[PDB]
Amino acid sequence: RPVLRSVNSREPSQVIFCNRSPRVVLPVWLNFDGEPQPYPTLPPGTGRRIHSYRGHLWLFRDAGTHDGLLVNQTELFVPSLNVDGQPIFANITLPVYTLKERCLQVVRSLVKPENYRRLDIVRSLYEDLEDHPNVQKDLERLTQERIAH
């Protein structure tokens, strides 16, 4: 009943996820309730043909930081049907982040959770750090994204 769920299309759609990003990629699938689900991770560079369904809803994150990744130059992925039996192609890449979270990501990995507070930084930054990107959030951000459009 939210406006980002997989349609119960009951139609097969053989789909290829290959990760062209340095990250370990986590396929996330928004089901029939719109609740994201974790699938087996893709090592960087490689990819697999998957049995998905027409009009299912896939998005992709770095399995580590949960950083937002792109797919076919977009946040979300929905296939359609395989024309003449040929398969759909999901090209998972890095987005041009802002140098802000780009750097956030780095500080975030090198510094353990508790000791963000030791870093010699201005005060708004401990919150910039402490709010590491989230999928449940990036679902709410996007629903009103498309509700405005």
Partner: protein, 88 residues
Amino acid sequence: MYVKLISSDGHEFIVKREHALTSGTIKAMLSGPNEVNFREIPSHVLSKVCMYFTYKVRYTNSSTEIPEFPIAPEIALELLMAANFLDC
């Protein structure tokens, strides 16, 4: 058209204006209907910030694979400080 973004120690980075427009700060410093000096941003921090520009112009709206941004763990606490201020 070009700008001259100078650092604290006195490094003068002449970059493309549209590249500089990537900053939200530097967009509201050139907005009056050139040069900008930064007093608390070093050179080793600003050259790397002029890099996000050449690369943000290059790779935003690109259908290819898009390369990772390189951050040496040492310039890592000073670019976050630069960027949070820069707004890019």
